[PDB]
């Protein structure tokens, strides 16, 4: 993953207690897990 927290096709996924949000950026929350 970027070093950015960038998610997805090329970067991979979040950590476990990070979630990939809605702009392609890991993050914590219910505003970022609960897509």
């Given amino acids: 993953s970027g070093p950015n927290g960038q998610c997805g096709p090329?970067?991979?996924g979040?950590?476990?207690?990070l979630?990939?949000?809605q702009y392609g950026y890991c993050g914590s929350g219910p505003?970022?897990?609960?897509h």
């Fill in 31 to 34: 505003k970022y897990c609960a």
């Fill in 14 to 17: 979040c950590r476990g207690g």
């Fill in 10 to 12: 090329g970067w991979g």
């Fill in 19 to 21: 979630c990939c949000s």
